[PDB]
Amino acid sequence: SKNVVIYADGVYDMLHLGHMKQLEQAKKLFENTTLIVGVTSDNETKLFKGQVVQTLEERTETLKHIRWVDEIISPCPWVVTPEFLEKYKIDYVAHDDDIYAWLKRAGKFKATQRTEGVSTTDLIVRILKNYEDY
Amino acid sequence: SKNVVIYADGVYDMLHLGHMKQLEQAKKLFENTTLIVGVTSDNETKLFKGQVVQTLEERTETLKHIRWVDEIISPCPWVVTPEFLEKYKIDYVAHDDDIYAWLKRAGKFKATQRTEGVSTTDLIVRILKNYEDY
Ligand SMILES: OB(O)c1ccccn1
Numbered sequence: 652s653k654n655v656v657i658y659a660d661g662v663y664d665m666l667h668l669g670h671m672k673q674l675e676q677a678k679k680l681f682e683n684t685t686l687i688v689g690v691t692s693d694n695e696t697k698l699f700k701g702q703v704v705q706t707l708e709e710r711t712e713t714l715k716h717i718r719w720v721d722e723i724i725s726p727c728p729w730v731v732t733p734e735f736l737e738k739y740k741i742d743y744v745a746h747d748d749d750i751y752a753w754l755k756r757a758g759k760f761k762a763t764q765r766t767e768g769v770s771t772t773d774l775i776v777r778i779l780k781n782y783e784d785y
Numbered sequence: 786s787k788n789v790v791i792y793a794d795g796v797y798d799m800l801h802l803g804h805m806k807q808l809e810q811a812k813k814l815f816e817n818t819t820l821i822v823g824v825t826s827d828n829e830t831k832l833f834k835g836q837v838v839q840t841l842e843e844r845t846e847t848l849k850h851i852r853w854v855d856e857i858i859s860p861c862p863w864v865v866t867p868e869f870l871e872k873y874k875i876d877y878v879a880h881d882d883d884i885y886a887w888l889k890r891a892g893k894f895k896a897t898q899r900t901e902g903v904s905t906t907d908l909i910v911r912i913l914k915n916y917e918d919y
């Protein structure tokens with residue numbers, strides 16, 4: 652019925668079918684949505700998560716081509732706060748399953764899923780199998 | 786003004802920013818367009834072009850998430866024919882610069898561009914530079 656603002660965030664390094672399926676799932680949680688995607692900065696990613704191949708600019712420019720994405724916040728904050736949700740009038744945070752306990756308490760948490768084995772790194776492995784060990 | 790059917794085709798193996806930028810360019814050739822994207826079959830790709838990492842199903846399922854894509858023909862014919870254009874009411878073929886001489890004669894050819902250095906294979910190279918030769 653009414654339009655619902657959905658927020659999802661992540662690194663989106665080397666975007667693959669698994670990311671795109673997650674975004675599609677967040678986008679379709681309700682009939683009418685605006686999906687805002689938050690892309691994490693290079694420094695914080697490396698400091699808290701580990702290695703990141705593509706810069707912030709590249710990760711963001713790729714996401715702009717995904718049909719489910721309605722707005723991008725780049726860089727986004729590393730931690731979602733209740734004031735961040737207020738600022739951008741966000742109704743739900745979409746994320747895959749506690750740092751989100753407060754989101755669930757407020758009724759603002761919606762789960763989405765991973766798809767294993769569709770990743771960019773996985774494809775390089777399929778390339779190398781064509782080259783037997785001996 | 787009027788709606789214009791654009792056709793672009795290719796392998797779309799390991800879809801990257803370079804593919805997505807090409808699609809965006811085809812999609813925006815005119816104000817109002819329908820972009821049909823043709824995805825080549827596995828056999829013909831291997832027989833005429835060479836190695837292809839992802840199957841037809843995977844290459845197609847990824848393209849479905851790109852915002853510029855309005856319809857996918859999967860598999861598409863390896864060679865575009867004047868009867869193929871008639872069948873799908875195609876006004877222009879979008880492709881990067883003769884097998885397309887007849888397209889240009891008919892006023893149905895529109896050039897688009899590559900973006901070098903944005904490829905999936907290129908990113909694996911950036912990963913490995915973190916591992917000095919010695
Ligand atoms: O990819 B992550 O686990 C992450 C980190 C901070 C904010 C959002 N996502």
Ligand SMILES: OB(O)c1ccccn1
Nearest residue numbers: 794795796825862863864
């Ligand atoms: O990627 B290709 O050069 C190609 C081959 C046949 C039809 C369309 N594109």
